[PDB]
Symmetry: D2
Subunit: 213 residues, 4 copies
């Protein structure tokens, strides 16, 4: 499962361990212990009571392409594993997030939204040109990259269990989160739902704290 | 894969996500990047330099049956997920770890090792008899169980990534750890080796800190 | 601050870093930023919205004496630091939790609550006698202790931040938790309230999930 | 204690809990247990054997001003607490890290190091000018800031225990880490040494893995 996000981003599921029954088993190993009706009720019971440790036995790995300002927010989720493309080690690609003019809907601006779009493209092009000039002059990559803007795309692998994923969705699939990461959270939710439908529906009904899903 | 440990214990692998190539990929997503020779060298490189985050993308779930004193030590490993049979909720089974007389090899004792074995069996039988008397009298399980000894068997599910597993092996597959948990660690190592042979061999060669493997 | 718990237990505050203003500062370093009215409102704002990271900058260390079955439950809180008296290394003291007859109020039993109390004392005395016999015969401590019951007292140091402490109180200062750990949680709450009154009151009003405080 | 880093950065100690004796106590609560000679030997013993949990009972809070590319690397240390100035919420200040010409010593470049310095200043000035134009036109701050470069200064509070701090120093006070974060790590080390001299010296002698301290 792969989902395009923003203008050049994506979220892709690379691997998964377990399913809804993984949580039911782990939880049962407590009672020294059925059928779809009872196992689904147990999932709802756990979710209703905040007994979320059993969901840690469901694990996902995603490959994500996102702008640096989005990745900065995402990487604040400490209960997870990350490995990210390095600007110290690699030549960084010319790929930037340019907001669509619709991104400014609701805001009165004193320059046209299409001109905001152009101004962002222009500065990012100038910054990349400076970056490449520095690189081609023999400046180390790790220094050259410091002129690149926060809308540069980066890529990372993310391994996260279902409990920590539900925390991420509470926080990022929510109107208070920046719109850009919301869009990534909606994609993560769609994949979670596909892989763990009983857990996801129980999450939405009983535990999900956000206002978008 | 299932392995008998001690007199009545076991370690069983329930599920696994990923393999040696999972770490190679995750690490490559850094260099914006081969073949078995190069991928194996990368694993050794990571291990040699303590660059262990890529191994967090390999995850295991085990089902473990072990005495409570072993589980107490094991559950000190915080970077992992656990769910354990409950004495508050369930009637606990009559199953205790009784050391073999060989457990005392090296120790001069003033009672015969076979008599130590009998004395342990006798007290555990008396404790269980009291437990069952309390339960059958209407004492709540969560109170009745407090008379049961630390050699009572318990069971748990353990979900752990390969980096945290390597930490566990450093500490528990080692002569300083109690012999009983060492035996469980040897089983965990055998399963890790089977599932992740390049990572395991690189671990032993370059990073493993213990003295048994 | 020290508080007696159960028959022989205690909770003592050893050290603390920070106060209510530590969370206000840390949070302000977000807005590049007052007075008691505004700082108290900010605390309530954070608590109301689940924005709890600023409370991680308040840290406590406690010294706790508790029975092993209580410590087993407590040590499940992974987002904290522990060091505990060892039965491998030390001769363990004759100190056991014996429930009061009032512990069984609400339960119809077919033996008198005072006789349950005596039966627990009797088995614990027999177990300790076996332990000491094994120790005095030259059995290693780490093996001898396996006959000791779960109501043996142990001691530990616990270092925990205020966010993780609030999680502990949600779970353990609650009717669903075993009564014995509830009593320890009530003591932890009393100390937290004394040290962080604005945070504590905001916690109770807006975020606390339990039913006892 | 406050230390200037780079051209406009700093590291300041805001608060601390505990000292070398905090680790000695916590560790002793294991043996159910002296003087400066014995307590210092215990610290060395723990460090020599990797028995580092007792050092988690020493905790620091720092206030750090650093460029975003440095903060991105720093915030990868998950076993710690962070709160950072927000570009969604605040107008960001015109403050950028401009490397000194000495930063390029060892590198043959085909433009003079002083001209690299000027090219970096020029692009950062243009990016900030665009940022301010967007802000003053009514573009939301959270969108306007995406044009700002990675050498923008940010500020954060960091609360970290001594074990996690030692991990940070292993990784960041080391020639493999980017020079800029090395400079911050050297400052963190100087403060750690001042506050915990026995732990620090034992760390350097027995456990420190880097090549700078
Ligand atoms: C709308 C919004 C605005 C934000 N604004 C800012 C801002 O201005 N500045 C800023 O710095 N950050 C900001 N954040 C980031 C925020 O403070 C969190 O870092 C982020 O939401 C991750 O949440 P988390 O800690 O629950 O997740 P994780 O770090 O994944 O932790 C998951 C859970 O584990 C626990 N946990 C993990 N580590 C610890 C620990 N050390 N102590 C206690 N419990 C722990 C907690 O229960 C936590 O919920 C903002 C986030 C949101 C959604
Ligand atoms: C021979 C031996 C004797 C022992 N004796 C005692 C004893 O007498 N008393 C006792 O209480 N315990 C004892 N232990 C337990 C020991 O203190 C550790 O709790 C256990 O070994 C788990 O190690 P860990 O913290 O590295 O693992 P985990 O808790 O799984 O942590 C893994 C890694 O994550 C990091 N980490 C996780 N949480 C934190 C945190 N909060 N702060 C900083 N870093 C963190 C560290 O890098 C750590 O190595 C003993 C263990 C051994 C092997
Ligand atoms: C009434 C009651 C009955 C219980 N019954 C049982 C039982 O029968 N069997 C049993 O084994 N346990 C049982 N528990 C223990 C329970 O499953 C938890 O281990 C314990 O409550 C600690 O909760 P916690 O994980 O939130 O705390 P911590 O481990 O301190 O974690 C704090 C927060 O950090 C986050 N976190 C930390 N580590 C991870 C991780 N690896 N993945 C995702 N998020 C993480 C979560 O947000 C978590 O809330 C019971 C607890 C209660 C209160
Ligand atoms: C020279 C250098 C180059 C780097 N290059 C890259 C790169 O190219 N791309 C990139 O993404 N990152 C890179 N990093 C970052 C690196 O991968 C680590 O994220 C960073 O060094 C923090 O290390 P840590 O995980 O030990 O620290 P923390 O996250 O603070 O963890 C401390 C300890 O807790 C344990 N721990 C915590 N969480 C877990 C977990 N979930 N599972 C298992 N154990 C855990 C481990 O024992 C760990 O050592 C680089 C770092 C260095 C120093
Ligand atoms: N906070 C908290 N955490 C918990 C639990 C809890 O009650 N509270 N418990 C719920 N538990 C189960 C297990 C099996 C069944 C069932 O068979 N009926 C029902 C519940 C397991 C355990 C998991 N962790
Ligand atoms: N502490 C520390 N952590 C790290 C690293 C590091 O150097 N030090 N890095 C090693 N990295 C790679 C990635 C690809 C190749 C390769 O293709 N040759 C080689 C190394 C990835 C990254 C992972 N984390
Ligand atoms: N999930 C989540 N986490 C968060 C926040 C958040 O909004 N949501 N933020 C709330 N923030 C502040 C800082 C200062 C003020 C004030 O001066 N008025 C108000 C709020 C800081 C930040 C901390 N972490
Ligand atoms: N991995 C590992 N972790 C450990 C220990 C250990 O041995 N290995 N232990 C070392 N311990 C002490 C306590 C007191 C003294 C002393 O009085 N002589 C000596 C050692 C405490 C405990 C802490 N954690
Ligand atoms: O919605 C937010 C706002 C902030 N942050 C974290 C990420 C950065 O570490 C820091 C500043 O982020 P920005 O506000 O500049 O995006 O706070 C988030 O995680 N999410
Ligand atoms: O080898 C050891 C010794 C101790 N402990 C931890 C587990 C308990 O929380 C506490 C006391 O354990 P025992 O020494 O009693 O096994 O310290 C271990 O994890 N491993
Ligand atoms: O209320 C509870 C019940 C269980 N457990 C955890 C602790 C043990 O690891 C395991 C079994 O505990 P008991 O039910 O036997 O107390 O589950 C708790 O933390 N709290
Ligand atoms: O020395 C390094 C190199 C990388 N990273 C982490 C931080 C970012 O999340 C990602 C890319 O960092 P840069 O290589 O671009 O600095 O990897 C570090 O923490 N330290
Ligand atoms: Cl390109
Ligand atoms: Cl039985
Ligand atoms: Cl005694
Ligand atoms: Cl300014």
């Amino acid at each position: 499962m792969k989902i395009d996000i923003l203008d050049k981003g994506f979220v892709e599921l690379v691997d998964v361990m377990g399913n809804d029954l993984s949580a039911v088993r782990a939880a049962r190993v407590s009672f020294d212990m059925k059928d779809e009706e009872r196992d689904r009720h147990l999932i709802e019971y756990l979710m209703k009571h905040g007994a979320e440790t059993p969901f840690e036995h469901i694990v996902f790995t995603f490959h994500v392409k996102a702008p640096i300002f989005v990745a900065r927010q995402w990487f604040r989720h400490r209960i997870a594993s990350y490995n990210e493309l390095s600007g110290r080690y690699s030549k960084l690609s010319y790929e930037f997030y340019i907001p669509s003019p619709e991104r400014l809907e609701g805001y009165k601006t004193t320059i046209p939204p299409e001109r905001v779009t152009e101004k962002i493209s222009e500065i990012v092009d100038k910054a990349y040109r400076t970056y490449l000039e520095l690189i081609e002059s023999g400046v180390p990559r790790e220094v050259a990259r410091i002129v690149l803007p926060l809308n540069l795309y980066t890529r990372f692998f993310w391994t996260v269990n279902a409990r920590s994923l539900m925390n991420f969705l509470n926080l990022r699939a929510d109107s208070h989160a920046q719109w850009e990461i919301q869009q990534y959270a909606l994609a993560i939710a769609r994949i979670f739902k596909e892989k763990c439908p009983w857990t996801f529906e129980a999450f939405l009904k009983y535990a999900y704290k956000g206002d978008i899903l």
